[PDB]
Amino acid sequence: IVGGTASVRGEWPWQVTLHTTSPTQRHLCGGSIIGNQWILTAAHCFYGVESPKILRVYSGILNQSEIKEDTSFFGVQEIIIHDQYKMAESGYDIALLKLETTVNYTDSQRPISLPSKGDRNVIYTDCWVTGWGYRKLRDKIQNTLQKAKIPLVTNEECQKRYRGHKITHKMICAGYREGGKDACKGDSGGPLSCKHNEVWHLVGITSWGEGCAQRERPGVYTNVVEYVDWILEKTQ
Numbered sequence: 001i002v003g004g005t006a007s008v009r010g011e012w013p014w015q016v017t018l019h020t021t022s023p024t025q026r027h028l029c030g031g032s033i034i035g036n037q038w039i040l041t042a043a044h045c046f047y048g049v050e051s052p053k054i055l056r057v058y059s060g061i062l063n064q065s066e067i068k069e070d071t072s073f074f075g076v077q078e079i080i081i082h083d084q085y086k087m088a089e090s091g092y093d094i095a096l097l098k099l100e101t102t103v104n105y106t107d108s109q110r111p112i113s114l115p116s117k118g119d120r121n122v123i124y125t126d127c128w129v130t131g132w133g134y135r136k137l138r139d140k141i142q143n144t145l146q147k148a149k150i151p152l153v154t155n156e157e158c159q160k161r162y163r164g165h166k167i168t169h170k171m172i173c174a175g176y177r178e179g180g181k182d183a184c185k186g187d188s189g190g191p192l193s194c195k196h197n198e199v200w201h202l203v204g205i206t207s208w209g210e211g212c213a214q215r216e217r218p219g220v221y222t223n224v225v226e227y228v229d230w231i232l233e234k235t236q
C-alpha cells in the first residue's frame with residue numbers, strides 16, 4: 001500500500017496473508033475470509049504455482065514478524081481459478097482457496113460479506129484497500145498491515161486512463177486523480193472493503209494497474225458483485 005497508514009489488531013479481520021513456501025517462505029498475496037473454509041483472492045497470484053502444497057494461509061496476522069516456526073496456519077486443500085482467467089489485465093482475476101480445516105471466528109479473524117443481493121444502486125463512498133505490499137517501487141513486503149482509503153472512479157473514467165486495455169463491468173477502479181494512495185506489489189488478492197450502513201462488504205479484489213499510485217492511473221479491482229453466482233456455486 002502506497003500512502004497508507006498502519007492498521008491495528010482486529011481492524012481488518014477478514015484479511016489474510018498467503019505465503020508460498022518454496023524456494024523460500026514469503027508473503028505472496030493477500031486474500032479475504034468469506035466463509036469458514038474459504039478465501040477469496042486473485043487468480044494471478046498463482047502463476048507458476050505447481051500445486052496447493054506450497055501454500056500456507058495465515059489469518060489473524062497484523063505484523064508479518066509475528067509469523068514464526070510455530071505460528072498456526074491453514075493448509076490449502078484446493079485452488080479454484082475462474083475458468084475464463086488468462087491474465088490479470090483481461091479480467092476474471094478471481095480465485096477461491098478451500099482450506100484444509102475451518103477457521104474459528106474471533107475478533108482477529110472473521111468473514112466479510114459479499115455485496116448484497118439487491119444493492120445494485122448503492123453508491124460506495126467509504127472504501128479501503130489493505131495489505132502488506134510495497135509502499136513505493138522496488139520496496140519489500142511491509143511488516144505491519146497497511147490501510148488506505150481510496151475513492152471509486154467510474155468505469156468510463158477508468159477506461160480513459162487505460163486506453164490500451166478493455167475495462168469491463170467485471171472490473172472496478174479506485175484511485176485519486178493526483179495519485180499518492182494505491183495498492184502495489186504484494187497487495188493483490190486482498191480486499192477493497194467498503195462500509196455501508198455500518199457493515200463492511202467485499203466490493204473489490206486488488207488486481208492490477210499501471211505502476212503504483214501514479215497520477216491518473218487508478219488501481220483496477222475485480223468487481224466482486226459480478227462474480228456472486230460463481231462464488232456461490234463454488235462454495236455451495
Ligand SMILES: CC(C)(C#N)c1cc(COc2ccccc2CC(=O)O)cc(-c2ccc3c(c2)[C@H](N)CO3)c1
Binds near residue numbers: 187
Ligand atoms: C512494483 C511493480 C513491479 C510495479 N509497477 C508491480 C509488480 C506486481 C507483480 O506482483 C505479482 C506478480 C505475480 C504474482 C503475485 C504478485 C503480487 C501482486 O500482484 O501484488 C504487482 C504490482 C501491483 C499490484 C497491485 C496493484 C498494482 C500493482 C496497482 N497499483 C493496483 O494494485 C506492481
